[PDB]
Amino acid sequence: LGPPDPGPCGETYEDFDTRILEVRNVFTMTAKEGRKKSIRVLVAVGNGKGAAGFSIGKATDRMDAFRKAKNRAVHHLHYIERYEDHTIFHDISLRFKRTHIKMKKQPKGYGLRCHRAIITICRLIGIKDMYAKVSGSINMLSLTQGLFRGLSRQETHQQLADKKGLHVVEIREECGPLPIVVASPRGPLRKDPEPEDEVPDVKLDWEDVKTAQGMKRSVWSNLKRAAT
Amino acid sequence: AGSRLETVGSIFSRTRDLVRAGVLKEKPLWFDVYDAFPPLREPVFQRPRVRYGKAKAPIQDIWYHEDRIRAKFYSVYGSGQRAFDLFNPNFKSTCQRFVEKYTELQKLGETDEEKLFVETGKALLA
Amino acid sequence: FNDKILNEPLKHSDFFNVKELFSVRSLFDARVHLGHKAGCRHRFMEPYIFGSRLDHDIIDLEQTATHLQLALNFTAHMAYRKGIILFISRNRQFSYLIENMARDCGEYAHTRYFRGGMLTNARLLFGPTVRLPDLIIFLHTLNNIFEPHVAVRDAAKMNIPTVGIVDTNCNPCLITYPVPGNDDSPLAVHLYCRLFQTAITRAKEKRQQVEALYRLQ
Amino acid sequence: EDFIKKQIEEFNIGKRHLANMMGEDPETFTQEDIDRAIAYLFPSGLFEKRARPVMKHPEQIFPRQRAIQWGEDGRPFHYLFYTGKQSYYSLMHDVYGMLLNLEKHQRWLI
Amino acid sequence: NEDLPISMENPYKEPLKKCILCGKHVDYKNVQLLSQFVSPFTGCIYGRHITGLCGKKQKEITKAIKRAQIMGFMPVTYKDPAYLKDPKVCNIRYRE
Amino acid sequence: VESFASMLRHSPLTQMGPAKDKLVIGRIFHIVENDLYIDFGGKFHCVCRRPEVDGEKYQKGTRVRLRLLDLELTSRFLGATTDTTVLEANAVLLGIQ
Amino acid sequence: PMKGRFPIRRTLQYLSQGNVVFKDSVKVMTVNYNTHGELGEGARKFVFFNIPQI
Ligand SMILES: [Zn+2]
Ligand SMILES: [Zn+2]
């Protein structure tokens, strides 16, 4: 729908784009009015470049609740530290209440393999394509809250380098063996190398092994999806 | 008009990213002041947890060499033998005078506790 | 058209002679290092508290003095830019003194019952174009009831550099520039109020002097 | 606040008109003349002390909207604006200070 | 430097209090002490809240009382009248 | 210039040692209809009503004597993660000087 | 995820990452060590990690 309205003195929030997500008709009895036809909505507003944020606006109306949720989102703008608008920093394996989030870092032109709500959230944030295994139950509100918590809890590259000190060594397969540093410390430099302890204790997921070994098989494994 | 995210972390980085993206069109005047003299600990939200298992606090009980002397004094004799003031700094009461006379005799004496305690008592009686 | 206000004050440490306003001995004379019991002590307040004297917490005056210097410099730089400061207090032990100090200072105060969200909904409750408080100084973070004041919540929701003397109950992590120390004795409160008044007056005097220097052109 | 001044000017113009045009040429005519005019050339046929034609000073009948306590640049002049009802809190503080001083020394309205 | 805290054994503290019979050896023959914790109206044994003994000591005292009652060294439904000269040991609520 | 611990090692609250049964003087800064806001320098303060001796004499700016009965007076209850503190002493009184 | 401690120990890829290939001569491979004895850290780590690869 249309963008949010500006503020009293200004704050041209028209740049952001609104996108209603879910709609629910709640019937709650009362002392005399009976089943109150209350409606609860969760809207997410944000054009991109990190500027975004969800909100809630329950009421017994439609446009009123929509504009209330829009104003709440305008007053609740979340920011997510990003690295090159295309993919998230690293993977996240969270367990928000009862909704699991298993994300995988993928390159450009890979495709959006995630929930349609997650697809819209990424389109509003700026992320182009990124794989994500929507494990656990499918609760819109809890899933969105967990996704926001995970996006807010992320270790960037510059901060990690400044904390540890060592540079970011990488051997990209697309390019040649020429290593290109992505981040450098802001002062000191740990001359000693990391404790290269082989066979570490990285609790990987069974889905990762099934995908690496191609053992996953079903009637809906990796089938062709719609366009756009 | 801005955001009200309190249970996320620190407001410094929030304002920084809001000004970078373009939300906060008008730079807050306190930004430069906070940057010139930052605090010792960033105001990051922390849920007030509780010490369940064997987790203890780092704070301990402070003790000085005069604590044992004052304890022995209060054990031997009765309560304070003087209307303590405590209004002026480093007030010299009967207990404080005894502690001072002790520190003058023990340490700096190297003999025994009973003899020096009796000497301090006699000096106080004098 | 005077961009020097954003560079002259923020250049030298203690521009308005912050460390000279108070003294370590003067602060110790008030016995501010004292604190409540370990049971009443807060978890996050452990790093700021040093030890205990028979279950009587003691706060290292060095960190408190550093935090006080930082907060005083911040308030002086804010006054140099013309800003509003809001004093809070509810223990009803020195409300008259805080009111007299606010009267002496060139700012406002509010040490009475705080209704349900007066700063959040300031658009409708207060005027539409109201100069919201740009700084907060807590004189008694603990109100009549053992419950953290809502001022910190409103500040975190409004993004305001919060100042105050945190006790052994509140959460200094929620406050920007906390100041550990006693918050019950009379001499300590009087010294803190006098220091704040002197800091504000000296900051205003330095602002006027710098304005005159600019006008000399 | 501008509405108050506009209504005051309108009332002044109406008073000037009712004085000059009508026979009552002295501009100092009291409210008795207005009451007589209402009783004669305005037979309301009612008995309400409110709905009846009452045209007097607007401040005496209007719920005056408090003007802007501060002009430009914000900064409320009163040092007790964030306390809600600055006058009441100021009076309370003054009474408390007077009581404290008098202690150191040693029907109502609707 | 020379004024830092010390790791002392907590001075200014008095040792824990004691009951009315800690460093002693109870016996099933001490009818006087056994009956002292008994009422002369129903032969009831005073509890711990009012009496103020420890777990082990109170357990031993009540065991000795029961042994004397069974064997025959103390009246069960009343207190021994031949050994009434006993100071106010327990806080006899009745009779004030 | 003395360090922080140097002053604490020779402070009144630390020089007196314990805090149980002592003879200490006090003063009042505010008078109530019956209560007396007695003070003696420290963390918290104390309160007391008009005693028998020197009833009408204990005015603003007088001197009294305290006994120091727990400067903090705090105790932990069952259903409460925080201890119910009193923030006062209210020690026994004696007289002037 | 995997219900084990060191999932990297068994991932095929980690097993194929080996290099040693016993010649057509050795017939049996017997190994024994004391686990409680921390002195044998090398033998323990071997029997734990390299046995799947072998
Ligand atoms: Zn506290
Ligand atoms: Zn026992």
UniProtKB/Swiss-Prot annotation, chain B:
For this UniProt record, the keywords arranged alphabetically read as follows: Acetylation, Disease variant, Mitochondrion, Primary mitochondrial disease, Ribonucleoprotein, Ribosomal protein
GO biological-process terms attached to the record: mitochondrial translation
The entry's cellular-component GO terms read: mitochondrial inner membrane; mitochondrial small ribosomal subunit; mitochondrion; nuclear membrane
- Give the source's domain of life in one word: Eukaryota
For this chain, one GO molecular function annotation is: RNA binding
Residue numbers of N6-acetyllysine PTMs: 101
Q: Which residues carry this modification: N-acetylalanine?
A: 1
**Subcellular location, record wording:** Mitochondrion
Q: What disease is recorded for this protein?
A: Combined oxidative phosphorylation deficiency 46: An autosomal recessive disorder characterized by childhood-onset mitochondrial respiratory chain complex deficiencies, particularly complexes I and IV, and hepatic disease.
UniProt lists the family membership as follows:
Belongs to the mitochondrion-specific ribosomal protein mS23 family.
Quote the subunit structure annotation: Component of the mitochondrial small ribosomal subunit (mt-SSU). Mature mammalian 55S mitochondrial ribosomes consist of a small (28S) and a large (39S) subunit. The 28S small subunit contains a 12S ribosomal RNA (12S mt-rRNA) and 30 different proteins. The 39S large subunit contains a 16S rRNA (16S mt-rRNA), a copy of mitochondrial valine transfer RNA (mt-tRNA(Val)), which plays an integral structural role, and 52 different proteins.
Q: What is this protein called?
A: Small ribosomal subunit protein mS23
Instruction: Record the organism.
Output: Homo sapiens (Human)
Curated annotation (Swiss-Prot), chain C:
Q: Where in the cell is it found?
A: Mitochondrion
Q: Does the keyword Mitochondrion apply?
A: yes
Q: Name one GO molecular function term.
A: structural constituent of ribosome
What changing residue 53 to C does, per the record, is: In COXPD36; results in impaired assembly of the small mitoribosomal subunit and impaired mitochondrial translation in patient cells
According to its UniProt entry, what is the function of this protein?
A: Required for mitoribosome formation and stability, and mitochondrial translation.
Associated clinical condition:
Combined oxidative phosphorylation deficiency 36: An autosomal recessive, multisystem disease resulting from deficiencies of mitochondrial respiratory enzyme complexes and mitochondrial dysfunction. Clinical manifestations include sensorineural hearing impairment, mild developmental delay, hypoglycemia, and intellectual disability.
What is the name of the protein in this document?
Small ribosomal subunit protein uS2m
Which organism is the protein's source?
Homo sapiens
Taxonomic classification: Eukaryota, Metazoa, Chordata, Craniata, Vertebrata
Q: What's the encoding gene here?
A: MRPS2
What stretch of the parent protein is included here? 58 to 274 of 296
Curated annotation (Swiss-Prot), chain E:
GO MF terms here are: small ribosomal subunit rRNA binding; structural constituent of ribosome
Q: Which GO terms describe its biological process?
A: mitochondrial translation; translation
UniProt KW keywords: Mitochondrion, Ribonucleoprotein, Ribosomal protein, Transit peptide
**GO cellular component labels:** mitochondrial inner membrane; mitochondrial small ribosomal subunit; mitochondrion
For the keyword Transit peptide, the answer is: yes
Q: Cellular location of this protein?
A: Mitochondrion
* Assembly notes: Component of the mitochondrial small ribosomal subunit (mt-SSU). Mature mammalian 55S mitochondrial ribosomes consist of a small (28S) and a large (39S) subunit. The 28S small subunit contains a 12S ribosomal RNA (12S mt-rRNA) and 30 different proteins. The 39S large subunit contains a 16S rRNA (16S mt-rRNA), a copy of mitochondrial valine transfer RNA (mt-tRNA(Val)), which plays an integral structural role, and 52 different proteins. bS18m has a zinc binding site.
**Misc remark:** There are 3 mitochondrial isoforms of bS18 in mammalia, localizing to 3 distinct sites in the mitoribosome. bS18m (bs18c, this protein) binds to the same site as bacterial bS18, mS40 (bS18b) binds to a novel location of the 28S small subunit, and mL66 (bS18a) binds to the 39S large subunit.
Q: Which family does it belong to?
A: Belongs to the bacterial ribosomal protein bS18 family.
Quote the protein name from its UniProt record: Small ribosomal subunit protein bS18m
Provide the species name: Homo sapiens (Human)
Q: What is the lineage of its organism?
A: Eukaryota, Metazoa, Chordata, Craniata, Vertebrata
Q: Which residues of the full protein are shown?
A: 47 to 142 of 142
From Swiss-Prot, chain F:
Q: In this chain, where does the modification N6-acetyllysine occur?
A: 57
Q: Which GO terms describe its molecular function?
A: RNA binding
Q: What's a single GO BP term from this record?
A: mitochondrial translation
Sorted keywords for this record are: Acetylation, Disease variant, Mitochondrion, Phosphoprotein, Primary mitochondrial disease, Ribonucleoprotein, Ribosomal protein, Transit peptide
Its localization reads: Mitochondrion
Note the effect listed for residue 43 to R.
In COXPD47; strong decrease in mitochondrial translation and in oxidative phosphorylation biogenesis; this phenotype could be reversed in patient's fibroblasts by transfection with the wild-type protein
GO CC list: mitochondrial inner membrane; mitochondrial small ribosomal subunit; mitochondrion
Could you tell me which cysteines form disulfide bridges?
Answer: none
So which disease is it linked with? Combined oxidative phosphorylation deficiency 47: An autosomal recessive, multisystemic, mitochondrial disorder characterized by intrauterine growth retardation, swallowing difficulties with failure to thrive, hypoglycemia, dehydration, and hepatomegaly. Additional features include global developmental delay with impaired intellectual development and absent speech, microcephaly, facial dysmorphism, cataract, sensorineural deafness, skeletal features, and cryptorchidism.
Describe the family membership recorded for this protein in Swiss-Prot or TrEMBL: Belongs to the bacterial ribosomal protein bS1 family.
Q: What is this protein called?
A: Small ribosomal subunit protein bS1m
**Organism in which the protein naturally occurs:** Homo sapiens (Human)
Lineage at the top is:
Eukaryota, Metazoa, Chordata, Craniata, Vertebrata
State the encoding gene: MRPS28
Tell me the part of the parent protein that is shown.
77 to 173 of 187
